[PDB]
From Swiss-Prot, chain A:
Origin: domain of life: Eukaryota
Domains: entry comment: A hydrophobic region that gives rise to the prediction of a transmembrane span does not cross the membrane, but is part of a discontinuously helical region that dips into the membrane and is probably part of the pore and of the selectivity filter. The extracellular N-terminal domain (NTD) is a site of allosteric regulation to modulate overall receptor function.
Protein's gene: GRIN1
Consequence recorded when altering residue 13 to R: In NDHMSD; loss of glutamate-gated calcium ion channel activity
Oligomeric form and interacting partners: Heterotetramer; the NMDAR subunits are modular and harbor tiered domains that function in concert to regulate opening and closing of the cation-selective ion channel pore. Forms heterotetrameric channels composed of two GluN1/zeta subunits (GRIN1), and two identical GluN2/epsilon subunits (GRIN2A, GRIN2B, GRIN2C or GRIN2D) or GluN3 subunits (GRIN3A or GRIN3B) (in vitro). Can also form heterotetrameric channels that contain at least two GluN1 subunits and at least two different GluN2 subunits (or a combination of one GluN2 and one GluN3 subunits) (in vitro).
Organism: Homo sapiens (Human)
The protein's name in its UniProt record: Glutamate receptor ionotropic, NMDA 1
Positions spanned in the full protein: 794 to 841 of 938
From Swiss-Prot, chain B:
Protein name, as recorded: Glutamate receptor ionotropic, NMDA 2A
Effect caused by changing residue 56 to S: In FESD; likely pathogenic
SUBUNIT field: Heterotetramer. Forms heterotetrameric channels composed of two GluN1/zeta subunits (GRIN1), and two identical GluN2/epsilon subunits (GRIN2A, GRIN2B, GRIN2C or GRIN2D) or GluN3 subunits (GRIN3A or GRIN3B) (in vitro). Can also form heterotetrameric channels that contain at least two GluN1 subunits and at least two different GluN2 subunits (or a combination of one GluN2 and one GluN3 subunits) (in vitro). In vivo, the subunit composition may depend on the expression levels of the different subunits. Found in a complex with GRIN1, GRIN3A and PPP2CB. Found in a complex with GRIN1 and GRIN3B.
Cytoplasmic side: 58-67
Upper classification of the organism: Eukaryota, Metazoa, Chordata, Craniata, Vertebrata
Full-protein residues shown: 539 to 690 of 1464
Function: Component of N-methyl-D-aspartate (NMDA) receptors (NMDARs) that function as heterotetrameric, ligand-gated cation channels with high calcium permeability and voltage-dependent block by Mg(2+). NMDARs participate in synaptic plasticity for learning and memory formation by contributing to the slow phase of excitatory postsynaptic current, long-term synaptic potentiation, and learning.
Outcome when changing residue 92 to S: In FESD; likely pathogenic; decreased localization to the cell membrane
Site feature: Functional determinant of NMDA receptors: 56
UniProt-reported outcome of changing residue 14 to K: Changed glutamate-gated calcium ion channel activity characterized by increased glutamate and glycine potency with delay in rise time and slower deactivation time course
Intramembrane segments: 43-57
Domain writeup: Contains an N-terminal domain, a ligand-binding domain and a transmembrane domain. Agonist binding to the extracellular ligand-binding domains triggers channel gating. A hydrophobic region that gives rise to the prediction of a transmembrane span does not cross the membrane, but is part of a discontinuously helical region that dips into the membrane and is probably part of the pore and of the selectivity filter.
Effect on the protein upon substituting residue 90 to S: In FESD; likely pathogenic; decreased localization to the cell membrane; results in increased agonist potency and channel activation at lower glutamate and glycine concentrations compared to wild type channels
Chain positions carrying an annotated carbohydrate: 3, 129
Organism expressing this protein natively: Homo sapiens (Human)
Amino acid sequence: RYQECLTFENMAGVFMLVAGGIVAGIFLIFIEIAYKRHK
Amino acid sequence: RSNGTVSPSAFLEPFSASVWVMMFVMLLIVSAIAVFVFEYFTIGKAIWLLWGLVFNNSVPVQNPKGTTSKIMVSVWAFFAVIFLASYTANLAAFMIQEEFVDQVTGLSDKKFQRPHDYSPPFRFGTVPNGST
């Protein structure tokens, strides 16, 4: 009679999508700063 | 039992674990990195923004700098409201389920040795010259 026996995957997917969006935003900020330095 | 017995599970929220904690840490790190990037006092304002648009913007933490700051704030707010919606849905789903497992789970577990010693004298209404 012995018995041996928020989602992280949701959290992981949200973290991955947020990281991608943040990387895109940082690249956009860098490009905009470079253009503004020339304009 | 006298009336309805259920498990409130007040502390059983998915918090206090390592599931959403890692996501929260990653999101906070990303937000701080983006704030530093857009920076091109500040620490206190950044902490205020991190604590604010995570729970709720119902506090004076307004301090934008540039368009990229607005874009990152929009993305972080979208993530935060998605998290709030997910938590509301999860708690409602828990409300859908229920827990009424057991109360004693044993014919001699603790009380059935000396009910007076346990304090409540549970009734022993057997039958004369019966079977049990």
